[PDB]
Each structure stands twice: as structure tokens, then as C-alpha cells.
Ligand SMILES: O=C(NO)[C@@H]1[C@H](c2ccccc2)[C@H]1c1ccc(-c2cnco2)cc1
Ligand code: NA
Ligand code: NA
Ligand SMILES: [Zn+2]
């Protein structure tokens with residue numbers, strides 16, 4: 270049986286300027302996905318679980334105390350709980366954004382009444398779902414959550430992320446269940462700099478990201494192929510980094526090629542007990558060159574989901590990260606839940622299924638393969 274998680278309190282994370290048109294990561298993203306699953310009958314076939322807020326203890330597996338006080342509490346308790354006197358003056362943390370609202374860095378917003386709650390419910394929702402699948406109470410699941418997580422570093426929010434929901438899930442799985450091997454696949458078009466950071470030296474967690482890299486200036490500018498891990502973790506960080514720009518743009522042929530030749534062989538060798546997926550949908554057609562640039566179909570994510578479902582005895586959980594375009598993210602979410610439920614994949618055209626990946630795609634794949642050939646038998 271497939272699980273779903275969602276909570277309407279996540280809608281309340283909204284800029285104080287009162288206008289979501291200045292802020293791409295907006296409440297409507299989840300709301301629409303949520304109704305799409307209703308109007309297709311998919312929600313009816315799933316178990317919808319009860320979310321909760323993450324405790325500060327739970328957030329502190331990934332993030333510092335200072336950071337968890339700053340973004341996990343309302344202002345009154347923020348003083349109450351900072352007995353260690355870690356925080357300086359809030360005067361220096363808050364700035365006025367170009368839209369007139371309150372934020373923290375030049376891009377990222379902050380609502381003092383609602384964002385802390387919302388950021389913590391996003392984590393707690395994922396955690397609840399992940400643990401329910403890991404203990405075998407559910408087959409698999411999809412976490413329709415907001416705000417996103419994978420850019421949140423130990424002590425820095427960025428890319429509209431405040432806490433790394435998926436990282437925390439994983440850490441809790443280690444600490445409270447002693448799960449031996451965890452796989453995190455991050456197919457959001459942007460690199461998950463936070464997640465990479467959180468497990469770079471840990472060989473019991475393998476992080477694989479497919480993302481646009483282009484020689485280091487695509488956001489967030491981390492995630493190079495030769496970043497492979499450190500210490501005992503060497504080899505358990507796989508950056509499937511696409512280089513060459515948008516000439517031509519990457520699409521279904523390219524991604525399916527990378528799965529077959531890089532992601533799935535390595536994942537199979539690792540043979541993980543649980544699979545977590547940072548499931549951003551910004552790689553889909555309809556994401557302009559700043560936000561995306563690539564041309565995947567939503568359908569395609571059905572194929573990617575199905576492939577991952579073969580691992581870990583099916584114990585797979587997808588959590589929303591990026592993806593802006595409403596049609597795209599609803600279509601893609603449709604495909605994935607449909608896959609998780611067990612339905613036959615709504616296919617791609619034979620024209621595509623026979624397409625050789627572009628020169629850039631191939632070159633990008635061969636560089637990763639050469640590097641990780643040192644660490645994985647299936648690449649020799
Ligand atoms: O997709 C994403 N993360 O995975 C990131 C945010 C996102 C998430 C969800 C919905 C919409 C957007 C998008 C982002 C892209 C570029 C910059 C940027 C550009 N120049 C400096 O910083 C900042 C944020
Ligand atoms: Na990624
Ligand atoms: Na690792
Ligand atoms: Zn604003």
C-alpha cells in the first residue's frame with residue numbers, strides 16, 4: 270500500500286509583501302499537486318498519513334542549534350530557549366527584500382508568524398512517511414511538501430530552503446533504527462549542496478545527483494563529477510553532472526541513458542535497505558534558462574520511479590524539492606504516484622525510446638564513469 274503526506278499549514282509560509290508573484294516557491298505549488306491527485310482518483314487509492322512538526326532535537330542531526338533556534342521557533346521562545354547565548358542580534362540577520370517583505374539573504378524570505386512552523390512541518394511530514402515505509406507499515410510513498418530542503422546547509426539557508434528534510438530523515442533512520450545502507454537520489458535539476466555536505470564522509474549513505482553543472486556557474490555552483498567523498502566515504506558521493514549547456518538541451522533520451530549506464534548499476538551494487546528521493550521536477554519542459562533549461566516529459570519520471578522501485582525491496586519514498594511550472598509538476602507528480610501504486614507506465618513515444626543521447630550527454634557520462642571506475646566493480 271502506497272502512502273501520501275500533506276498539510277495545509279505549509280501553505281501559510283508566504284512573504285510579508287503579500288504577493289506570491291515575486292516568489293517562485295509559492296503555496297500554490299502544493300495546493301495544485303494536491304488537487305491534481307484528487308481529480309485523478311489517485312489520492313483515493315492511497316493512505317494519507319498525519320503529519321507533524323520536527324522537534325529541534327531531530328533537526329539538530331543535520332543543523333546547528335543556533336540555526337534551529339533561528340528558523341524553528343517563534344520569537345518569544347527563541348529568546349527563552351537560547352540559554353547558551355548562541356545568537357547575536359536579529360538586527361543583523363533580517364533585511365528588507367526588493368519586494369518590501371522581510372527576508373534573510375538577498376533571495377530568501379521569512380515570515381515570523383508562520384515560516385518556522387511551516388519549515389518544521391515539512392521535515393516532520395517526510396520523517397513520518399519515511400519511517401512508516403522503513404518499518405514495513407507501507408509499501409512506498411510520496412511527500413507533497415514545502416518549503417524544499419536540499420540546499421539547506423548546516424548553518425545556512427539558501428535556495429528557498431531552511432531545513433534539509435531528506436537529510437534529517439536519513440540521519441534519524443541511522444540513529445533510531447540502525448539502518449545499514451541508505452540511498453539518496455536527487456533528480457531535481459539543481460545540485461543538492463546540503464545533502465552532499467551532510468554525508469560526504471559517511472559510506473553508509475550514498476548520494477547520487479543528476480543535475481545541470483556546466484562548468485560551475487549554474488545554481489548553486491557545486492556538484493562537480495570529481496567530488497566523490499572523503500575519508501571512508503570516498504566513492505559514496507556520485508555527482509552525475511551534465512556539462513555542455515543547452516546546445517542541445519537535455520531530455521528523456523539523456524536521462525534514461527544516465528539511469529541505465531550510471532545510476533542503476535551503481536545503486537544495484539550498493540544494494541541499499543531504503544531509498545530516499547529528492548524529487549524535484551524542474552528538469553521538465555517549461556523551465557526557462559535561469560530556473561531549468563532542460564526538456565524532460567513528466568511521463569519520464571514514471572519510468573525513473575519504476576526503475577528505483579526495483580531496489581530496497583520496493584522501500585522507496587519521494588519528497589518534493591523544486592519544480593515551478595504548475596502543469597509540469599502536477600503531471601510529473603501524477604506519473605510518480607501512478608508508478609508507486611503499480612500501474613503500467615503511460616509510455617513515451619517509440620521515436621524517443623530509440624533516440625541516441627547527445628554528444629554532451631555522452632561526454633558527461635563518460636567522465637563520471639572514468640572517475641567512479643576506481644570505486645565500483647560494475648564500471649570496470
Ligand atoms: O529548484 C531549486 N532548487 O532545487 C531552486 C529554487 C526553487 C525551488 C522551488 C520552486 C522554485 C524555485 C530555485 C532557485 C534557482 C536559482 C536561484 C538563484 C539564481 N541566482 C542565484 O540563485 C535561486 C533559487
Ligand atoms: Na539533483
Ligand atoms: Na556518503
Ligand atoms: Zn515578497
Ligand SMILES: [Zn+2]
Nearest residue numbers: 457459551591
Ligand atoms: Zn531545483
